Write a protein that binds this ligand. Structure first.
Ligand SMILES: CCCCCCCCCCCCCC(=O)SCCNC(=O)CCNC(=O)[C@H](O)C(C)(C)COP(=O)(O)OP(=O)(O)OC[C@H]1O[C@@H](n2cnc3c(N)ncnc32)[C@H](O)[C@@H]1OP(=O)(O)O
Ligand SMILES: COc1cccc(CC(=N)NC(=O)c2cc(Cl)ccc2OC2CCNCC2)c1
Ligand SMILES: [Mg+2]
Length: 411
């Protein structure tokens, strides 16, 4: 049933996943010297290409491939349109490895056919709490603790094959050549997400959405007017009213994050993320990169009412193309990114995320039920969607965890 994934170092079934009780590799690593420098074989009419994702024109080339060929909804009405500025931000964090950005080009016309990207991540990926207790109950704490220390691994995203080259087994070749480039740097695990089910997730969270401009969302067919609103004389006025928000934030001393806030934001974020089984560790440089505001890309605010940052939230922007609507070309979506609350309840913090996003022309706010995202869903009028983000590891056996024990936000 899986001609490629049955050949890879990942758990193959839920039955196998259930027997996993410690974190650790699926296959013990070889060494860099065991990995060839000759690139993986590719058809003589194609070639590997490493774009430079800090050079505007190479960013633009990958931007067009993804604009025209990256993820669509299931009814082909919307397609992600990640911006050029977002792509440079996502793929060039501190200490990134240019060789982990891998493309395929057709030699005759130089057409860009495919892309995949890795970036470094420092991840806590040791045995989860509930399995550490089971191990202690049996005298097996040492086996369960062996990989507790954060690991420097690869985060994969942006796999894309051009629509003309679909279903030709190009994706497995690109994944093998990315795996070779990562293993040549002595890294043997990766983490990745997908909205589709593959062998085999270690966690799965449902999508949630919070309408900010319901009239546009119903116009472009992201949403409908729900049945319950058809009982009113003006169903769309009632829907607008249900989703209406303040026009300015409610927390005193909310402001955009500044470079001087990086140490405090790091401290309160890392203390919060320790409560979860799987989560990133960020240096000052990585907090700077991933959370300082960037126009059109990442939005981050801190609560500092009395000269101390006590709370913060972030969100990132991905517009989607709307195929074929005469009123609108884009669906402008905000995605909940990292946050931490130490002085106010989380629903009070995230209400200001929704107010800032709506004020800035966002149409919807999206999130997965990771972190403590479930703790504000009903009061803030998020509703579950009909999709799930599944979390995977490459070459890492991991006991199944609930999505409220995941703290890695995917871009
Ligand atoms: C140590 C370092 C390790 C580094 C690498 C770690 C692993 C990283 C893994 C990648 C993480 C990516 C994270 C993201 O970016 S998730 C976003 C993925 N991108 C899209 O959905 C964009 C639109 N779709 C496409 O561009 C293509 O349909 C893709 C490229 C998805 C497949 O191209 P195509 O449709 O032309 O098919 P094929 O004939 O070439 O290949 C068929 C094989 O591909 C398997 N497939 C389908 N979808 C996915 C998917 N989302 N993750 C992994 N595998 C996937 C499929 O089960 C089949 O295998 P098997 O069922 O026969 O066994
Ligand atoms: C409606 O417009 C679209 C356009 C294209 C695709 C889709 C369906 C879809 N895949 N959603 C998501 O992935 C997603 C949904 C939510 Cl709640 C939260 C995060 C999501 O992902 C982010 C960005 C993509 N990397 C993984 C994390 C719908
Ligand atoms: Mg293919």
């Amino acid at each position: 049933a899986h001609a490629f994934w049955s050949t890879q170092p990942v758990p193959q079934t839920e039955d196998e996943t259930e027997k996993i009780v410690f974190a650790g590799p699926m296959d013990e690593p070889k060494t860099v010297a065991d990995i060839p420098e000759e690139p993986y074989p590719i058809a003589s009419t194609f070639e590997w290409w490493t774009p430079n994702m800090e050079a505007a024109d190479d960013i633009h080339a990958i931007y067009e491939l993804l604009r025209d060929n990256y993820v669509e909804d299931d009814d082909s009405m919307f397609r992600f349109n990640y911006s050029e500025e977002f792509l440079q931000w996502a793929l060039c964090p501190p200490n990134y490895i240019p060789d982990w950005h891998v493309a395929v080009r057709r030699k005759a016309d130089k057409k860009l056919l495919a892309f995949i990207a890795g970036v470094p991540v420092t991840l806590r990926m040791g045995t989860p709490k509930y399995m550490k207790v089971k191990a202690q109950e049996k005298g097996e704490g040492e086996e369960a603790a062996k990989y507790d220390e954060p690991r420097h691994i690869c985060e994969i995203n942006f796999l894309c094959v051009h629509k003309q080259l679909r279903e030709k087994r190009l994706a497995p070749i690109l994944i093998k050549e990315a795996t070779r480039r990562v293993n040549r740097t002595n890294v043997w695990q990766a983490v990745y997400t997908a909205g589709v089910l593959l062998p085999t997730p270690y966690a799965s969270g449902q999508y949630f959405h919070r309408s900010l401009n319901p009239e546009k969302l119903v116009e472009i067919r992201f949403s409908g007017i729900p049945a319950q609103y058809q009982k009113f004389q003006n169903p769309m006025a009632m829907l607008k009213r249900n989703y209406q928000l303040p026009s300015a934030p409610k927390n005193s001393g909310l402001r955009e994050m500044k470079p001087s806030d990086v140490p405090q934001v790091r401290r309160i974020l890392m203390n919060y993320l320790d409560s979860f089984d799987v989560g990133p560790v960020f240096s000052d440089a990585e907090i700077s990169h991933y959370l300082l505001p960037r126009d059109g890309v990442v939005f981050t605010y801190v609560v500092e009412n009395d000269k101390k940052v006590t709370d913060f939230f972030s969100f990132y922007r991905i517009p989607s193309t709307v195929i074929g609507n005469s009123n609108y070309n884009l669906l402008n979506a905000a995605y909940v990114h990292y946050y931490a609350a130490t002085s106010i309840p989380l629903h009070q913090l995230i209400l200001d995320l929704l107010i800032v996003a709506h004020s800035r022309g966002f149409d919807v706010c999206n999130m997965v039920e990771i972190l403590d995202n479930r703790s504000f869903v009903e009061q803030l009028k998020f509703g579950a969607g009909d999709g799930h983000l599944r979390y995977y590891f490459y070459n890492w056996a991991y006991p199944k965890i609930k999505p409220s024990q995941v703290a890695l936000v995917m871009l």
